[PDB]
Design a protein around this ligand. Structure first.
Ligand SMILES: Nc1ccn([C@H]2C[C@H](O)[C@@H](COP(=O)(O)O)O2)c(=O)n1
Ligand SMILES: Nc1ccn([C@H]2C[C@H](O)[C@@H](COP(=O)(O)O)O2)c(=O)n1
Lengths: 217, 217
């Protein structure tokens, strides 16, 4: 039966378990906007040790960590010049500027209101709906929001994904989300608890099945 | 140990299981913005049969269904005059007008783009952050977003809650979310699949423990 809740010690184990389950026990096999995929709706993934956001298996190589680190610097710096930022790799929907806008208010709430439930970074917003009936290629944000809260000296993170390509782009999302929760934790002078990753659509495209089978076992 | 994933046949069973688990196996016991509570972070709840949104146990009575139906009419009508709407019960953050604004674009995507992953109603948005450092009493939206998708003739729903009072207001949230997914399903001419309810903070205030113990068993 389809397992929808996956607890793992580190990002890699979570990553492999999620991919394994979508390949073997999908909820849907479906034609999507960009091709056929196996899909599991409303997957919940928990990572016990979120300092583990750089995975170690070199066979998971479709997102290089040279690229992922360049992407991190690009998005934490809140820049808009992606053409220049990625020239070594061949209205906007960049996450960086949105995180930058919300940082002062959210950090204030997080540091000053004890045990707050209100610290939510919006990534996807309703103004992005102008992309739906368009022929633009801009990303309609796959990340819906990231919630942070501090209890008893520890920072807990919940990233809610509208849409997640679990074989490829999830490698990048994990890296970026891991870096960001550590940035937030360091700013607040607290330690890290755990990380939770929900995805309304958790999918692997059929064109990537062989790649996935390459890093399982 | 704290159970964070709860699958139930109907809303009531889910409702009772969630409350039971927060009372008996909380992750945190914490001082919040509005008093002490038991709390479980990143709870995931699945309801198999979402037509069951009106629960039947009369002991769960802090949200009357007379009130809940009045609230439904108020929010689906996209009104702003809550003073008049609720005169029988003693910038805005109303959900209704936000749902109304997004309905045309989201319905279009849902009906016209097959197997879309993009149909997300934003409730909580970053402009609401102006409430954080304020002395207004307006609700800072507890509901983050509601995602809808259709596969093989069935409508699936994922409601992501930033913050959920599981003993009291969850009775209202379930009713409203149940009515809305059926409104959406009927508009699209499709049947209903299942409903998923994630809550970054799932909590019961200590002042409501006796009320909860009243409807368990
Ligand atoms: N941060 C991101 C951005 C995008 N995507 C992936 C998910 C989908 O495979 C595709 C988005 O397509 P759609 O808008 O149809 O969901 O990109 C992702 O996994 N993570
Ligand atoms: N639709 C809603 C609106 C509000 N709340 C509850 C959750 C919290 O108990 C409180 C919001 O407080 P805070 O902003 O501190 O999370 O109201 C809820 O459960 N459901």
């Amino acid at each position: 039966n389809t397992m929808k809740y996956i607890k793992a010690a580190d990002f890699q184990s979570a990553f492999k378990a999620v991919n394994r389950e979508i390949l073997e026990n999908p909820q849907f096999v479906t034609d999507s906007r960009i091709g056929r995929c196996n899909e599991i709706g409303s997957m919940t993934v928990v990572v016990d040790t979120p300092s583990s956001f750089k995975m170690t298996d070199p066979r998971i190589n479709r997102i290089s960590y040279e690229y992922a680190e360049d992407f991190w610097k690009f998005m934490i710096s809140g820049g808009t010049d992606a053409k220049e930022a990625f020239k070594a790799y061949p209205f906007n929907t960049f996450y960086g500027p949105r995180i930058a806008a919300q940082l002062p208010a959210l950090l204030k709430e997080l540091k000053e209101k004890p045990n707050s439930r209100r610290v939510v970074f919006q990534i996807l917003e309703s103004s992005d709906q102008a992309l739906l009936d368009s022929d633009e290629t801009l990303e309609y944000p796959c990340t819906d929001s990231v919630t942070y809260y501090i209890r008893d000296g520890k920072l807990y993170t919940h990233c809610h994904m509208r849409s997640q390509n679990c074989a490829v782009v999830m490698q990048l999302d994990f890296y970026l989300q891991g870096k960001l929760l550590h940035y937030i934790a360091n700013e607040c002078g607290v330690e890290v608890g755990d990380y939770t990753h929900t995805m309304v659509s958790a999918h692997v495209f059929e064109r990537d099945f062989d790649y996935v089978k390459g890093f399982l076992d």
